[PDB]
Paper text:
Here, we report structural and biochemical characterizations of the intrinsic substrate preference of DOMAINS REARRANGED METHYLTRANSFERASE 2 ([name]), a plant DNA methyltransferase responsible for establishing all cytosine methylation and maintaining [name] methylation. In plants, the establishment of DNA methylation in all sequence contexts is mediated by DOMAINS REARRANGED METHYLTRANSFERASE 2 ([name]), following an RNA-directed DNA methylation pathway. Among nine [name] motifs, the [name] methyltransferase (MTase) domain shows marked substrate preference toward CWW (W = A or T) motifs, correlating well with their relative abundance in planta.
Consistent with what was observed for other [name]-DNA complexes, the catalytic loop (residues 585–596) of [name] enters the DNA minor groove, with residue R595 intercalating into the A11′pG10′ step on the non-target strand; on the other hand, a loop–helix (αA)–helix (αB) (LHH) motif of the TRD occupies the DNA major groove centered around the (fC)TA motif. Detailed comparison of the two alternative conformations of the [name]-bound [name] DNA reveals that Thy12′ undergoes a negative propeller twist from conformation II to conformation I (36.5° vs 29.6°), resulting in a greater inter-base pair stacking for the T12′pA11′ step (136 Å2 in conformation I vs 121 Å2 in conformation II). Such a difference in base-stacking interaction between the two conformational states is accompanied by a differential interaction between the [name] DNA and the TRD of [name]: In conformation II, Thy12′ and Ade11′ are in proximity with the TRD, reminiscent of what was observed for the [name]-CTT complex.
Residue numbers in the entry: 274 to 626
Write the structure that this text describes.
DNA sequence: TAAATTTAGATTAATAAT
DNA sequence: ATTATTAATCTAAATTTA
């Protein structure tokens, strides 16, 4: 039977909403150690999440929209073997509505733009010609109290399609890097250093975790590991899970990071340094060159991996991909199985057989 | 030569309408 | 209920700036 997305997309329960569930039946092959956490986009081509679940011990995915955790939607799926009781959110939560997240937008927001939430944060922002086209479309009716509904359709559909916010007289501009940084739960300028360019900043932010959601999911580890954890971070990026564990005050004794982008690794090393992390950070580039024996040796040296967290590329799954949305076997999304390979190695030592 | 700026629809799920 | 519509969507790549 096909996997059907839950409506509402509250997963096993979100804060301030009904429907919390504290118990879950997990397959025996799914039991830890290690605890593992896999994330990807929910809106994939057909049959993708079924294959991911089949390769991850048949764990039914938890489908969560981060719009219950911040101002911007993020319909993601997470497969894990974590306990689902005693979850708690990191404090303080991000601003929930557009009115609170963008305090100056009052001055420019139109009454007919009835948006309360922003759409998903992607790696492609609206173009300046888009802002100028909306400005030119609405200027003729400046002296009129409200433009007729036929242009309202166009402008509202463009604002939703490109996730624009009102900043000037008739200016609907996309989000700025620090804006999506705060919305995605990262501290200010978390991705500003390391010689990363603005374009690379956008691409890395669009591809990242919403820290509050992942932290709500990972909070159950705090009572389990009083003296810190060993982390295997696959497809680390700008370090979503690391920031989440940092906000959860869960000591990260060791982090083996695997991330091919050098500016991403520099951002992770920066975050490690500016937060004065006591533990050790090890960085790897290509997961395809990470050998099974390297994983086994690292485990023997440090004592296994308490948690294996990652999100393989959603490249060939995202609906925004025009040319190469070929599914799980795409050149980049297929790296998912790489994840599964390293996970098995870890399991081979912690539970064995 | 790195950045930034354009230049490009399709696939499903959700919702409304038979 | 079967199905029309409405809607959301962690992008790729070819130019052009600077
Ligand atoms: N072959 C490979 N080996 C290691 N990492 C890879 C890879 N191919 C792609 N990646 C990386 O995998 C990442 C997935 S995006 C996940 C990062 C996000 N900040 C998060 O916290 O989850 C991308 O940053 C991409 O650069």
């Amino acid at each position: 039977e096909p996997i059907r997305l839950p409506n509402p997309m509250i997963g096993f329960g979100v804060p301030n909403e009904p429907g919390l569930i504290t118990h879950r039946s997990l397959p025996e092959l799914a039991r830890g150690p290690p605890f593992f956490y896999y994330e990807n986009v929910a809106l994939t081509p057909k049959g993708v999440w079924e294959t991911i679940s089949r390769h991850l011990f048949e764990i039914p995915p938890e489908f969560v929209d981060s719009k219950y955790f911040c101002v911007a939607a993020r319909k993601r799926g997470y497969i894990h073997n974590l306990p689902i009781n005693n979850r708690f959110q990191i404090q303080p939560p991000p601003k929930y509505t557009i009115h609170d997240a963008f305090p100056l937008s009052k001055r420019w927001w139109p009454e007919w733009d009835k948006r309360t939430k922003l759409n998903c944060i992607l790696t492609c922002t609206g173009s300046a010609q888009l802002t100028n086209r909306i400005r030119v479309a609405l200027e003729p009716y400046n002296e009129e109290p409200e433009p007729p509904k036929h242009v309202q359709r166009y402008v509202i559909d463009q604002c939703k399609k490109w996730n624009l916010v009102w900043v000037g007289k008739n200016k609907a501009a996309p989000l700025e890097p620090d804006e999506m940084e705060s919305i995605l739960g990262f501290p200010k300028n978390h991705t500003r250093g390391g010689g990363m360019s603005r374009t690379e900043r956008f691409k890395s932010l669009g591809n990242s975790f919403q820290v509050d959601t992942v932290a709500y999911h990972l909070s159950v580890l705090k009572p389990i590991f009083p003296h810190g954890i060993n982390v295997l971070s696959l497809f680390t990026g700008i370090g979503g899970g690391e920031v989440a564990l940092h906000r959860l005050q869960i000591k990260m004794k060791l982090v083996v990071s695997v991330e091919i982008s050098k500016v991403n690794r520099n951002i992770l090393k920066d975050f490690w340094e500016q937060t004065n992390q006591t533990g050790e950070l090890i960085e790897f580039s290509d997961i395809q060159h990470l050998t099974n024996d390297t994983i086994e040796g690292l485990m023997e040296k440090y004592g296994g991996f308490d948690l294996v967290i990652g999100g393989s590329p959603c490249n060939n799954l995202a609906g925004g991909n025009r040319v190469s949305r070929v599914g799980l076997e795409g050149d980049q999304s297929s790296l998912f199985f790489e994840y599964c390979r390293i996970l098995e190695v870890v399991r081979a030592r912690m539970r064995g057989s």
